[PDB]
């Protein structure tokens, strides 16, 4: 799992940045070829968090999730991942309002397949949103950003926290309980974002105003040009009572069926 720093070449430019530090593009020397990578570099609390993130990614193996190549302990701690060249889905759609409905359905279906896998594997993502889906190509999405993610214990169906409120289900806010069904709620917000071309959800509202709106049974409206069936699926993801909300098996099947007849 530990990579050799001498086999990594970084670019100077940064792709992004935050309290942890920076994300830069680089190249990792393999047997013959070089592999383009995205490298999360700590400008260092922070250590354990990066190590926990890599620990999650190390356990996942699925085409619609960002793969970890390894960790590099060098001038800084570095989490080396396969590169998603086109970057975050929200930003991509904000810059490319031409993308067709059918292409959006294809991408959100790919996210649902990743998430179905994540749910089967008993991990909760806890930060599922359009900014955390990355594009390989205009037709290939991957789930990223496993910093808040939790491996559920073998005999528990949720994680009790001890916040991206606009993406959180009522049971997360009210009871601090995070399940695969909480991620389904998030997935519905992600779908709304995708069909809105990377607009922000609940525009202009405080977290507490969002919670009140939801408790009145109010939900965001159908984005322009979003198909009825896809809005109906969003509303099903925003099922208030977690017990009655679909899991990702049911969500992925709905998307699959709709895509393969649209
Ligand atoms: C071409 O432009 C871009 C390409 C890429 N590609 C690409 N590929 C594979 C992996 C990753 C990647 C980025 C991050 C990350 O930590 N992002 C920070 C800024 C925000 N997170 C929210 C909590 C931390 N992680 C965990 N994985 N990124 C990314 C671009 O981020 C803005 C931009």
UniProtKB/Swiss-Prot annotation:
GO CC annotations on file: B cell receptor complex; cytoplasm; cytosol; early phagosome; nucleus; plasma membrane; protein-containing complex; T cell receptor complex
Post-translational modifications reported in the UniProt record: Ubiquitinated by CBLB after BCR activation; which promotes proteasomal degradation. Autophosphorylated. Phosphorylated on tyrosine residues by LYN following receptors engagement. Phosphorylated on tyrosine residues in response to IL15.
GO molecular function, one term: phospholipase binding
Subcellular localization, as worded in the UniProt entry: Cell membrane; Cytoplasm, Cytosol
GO BP, one annotated term: receptor internalization
Modified residues (Phosphotyrosine): 2, 117, 140, 158-159, 175, 258-260
UniProt entry keywords in alphabetical sequence: Adaptive immunity, Angiogenesis, ATP-binding, Cell membrane, Cytoplasm, Disease variant, Host-virus interaction, Immunity, Innate immunity, Kinase, Membrane, Nucleotide-binding, Phosphoprotein, Repeat, SH2 domain, Transferase, Tyrosine-protein kinase, Ubl conjugation
Annotated positions of the Phosphothreonine modification: 22, 211
Record PTM Phosphoserine, positions in chain: 17, 208
Residues involved in ATP binding: 15-23, 40
Tissue expression pattern: Widely expressed in hematopoietic cells (at protein level). Expressed in neutrophils (at protein level). Within the B-cell compartment, expressed from pro- and pre-B cells to plasma cells.
All copies of domain Protein kinase, residue ranges: 9-260
Coiled-coil annotated residue ranges, if any: none
Domain of life: Eukaryota
Active site: 127 (proton acceptor)
Effect on the protein of changing residue 259 to F: Loss of interaction with BLNK
Family: Belongs to the protein kinase superfamily. Tyr protein kinase family. SYK/ZAP-70 subfamily.
Binding partners and assembly: Interacts with LYN; phosphorylates SYK. Interacts with RHOH (phosphorylated); regulates mast cells activation. Interacts with NFAM1 (phosphorylated); probably involved in BCR signaling. Interacts with VAV1 (via SH2 domain); phosphorylates VAV1 upon BCR activation. Interacts with GAB2 (phosphorylated); probably involved in IgE Fc receptor signaling. Interacts (via its SH2 domains) with CD79A (via its phosphorylated ITAM domain); the interaction stimulates SYK autophosphorylation and activation. Interacts with FCRL3.
Disease (UniProt): Immunodeficiency 82 with systemic inflammation: An autosomal dominant immunologic disorder with onset in early childhood. It is characterized by recurrent infections with various organisms, and multi-organ inflammation that manifests as colitis, hepatitis, arthritis and dermatitis. Patients have a propensity for the development of lymphoma, usually in adulthood. Disease severity is variable.
Primary role: Non-receptor tyrosine kinase which mediates signal transduction downstream of a variety of transmembrane receptors including classical immunoreceptors like the B-cell receptor (BCR). Regulates several biological processes including innate and adaptive immunity, cell adhesion, osteoclast maturation, platelet activation and vascular development. Assembles into signaling complexes with activated receptors at the plasma membrane via interaction between its SH2 domains and the receptor tyrosine-phosphorylated ITAM domains.
Comment text on domains: The SH2 domains mediate the interaction of SYK with the phosphorylated ITAM domains of transmembrane proteins. Some proteins like CLEC1B have a partial ITAM domain (also called hemITAM) containing a single YxxL motif. The interaction with SYK requires CLEC1B homodimerization.
The name this protein goes by in its record: Tyrosine-protein kinase SYK
Taxonomic source organism: Homo sapiens (Human)
Whole-protein residues included: 363 to 633 of 635
């Amino acid at each position: 799992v530990y990579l050799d720093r001498k086999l990594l070449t970084l670019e100077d430019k940064e792709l992004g940045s935050g309290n942890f530090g920076t994300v830069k593009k680089g190249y990792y020397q393999m047997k013959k070829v070089v592999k383009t990578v995205a490298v999360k570099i700590l400008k260092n609390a922070l250590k354990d968090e990066l190590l926990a993130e890599a620990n999650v990614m190390q356990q996942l193996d699925n085409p619609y999730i960002v793969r970890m190549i390894g960790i590099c302990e060098a001038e800084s701690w570095m989490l080396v991942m396969e590169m998603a060249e086109l970057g975050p889905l929200n930003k991509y759609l904000q810059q490319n309002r031409h993308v067709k409905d059918k292409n959006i359905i294809e991408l959100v279906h790919q996210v649902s397949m990743g998430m179905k896998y994540l749910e089967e594997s008993n991990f909760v993502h806890r930060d599922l949103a359009a900014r955390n889906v990355l594009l390989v190509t205009q037709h290939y999405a991957k789930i990223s950003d496993f910093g808040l993610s939790k491996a559920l214990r073998a005999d528990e169906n949720y994680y009790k926290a001890q916040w991206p409120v606009k993406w959180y289900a009522p049971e997360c806010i009210n009871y601090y309980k995070f399940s695969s069904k909480s991620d389904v709620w998030s997935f519905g917000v992600l779908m709304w974002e995708a069909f809105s071309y990377g607009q922000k959800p609940y525009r202009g509202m405080k977290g507490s105003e969002v919670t009140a709106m939801l408790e009145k049974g109010e939900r965001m409206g159908c984005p322009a040009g979003c198909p009825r069936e896809m809005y109906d699926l969003m509303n099903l993801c925003w099922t208030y009572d977690v017990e009655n909300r679909p899991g990702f098996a049911a969500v992925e099947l709905r998307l699959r069926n709709y895509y393969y007849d649209v």
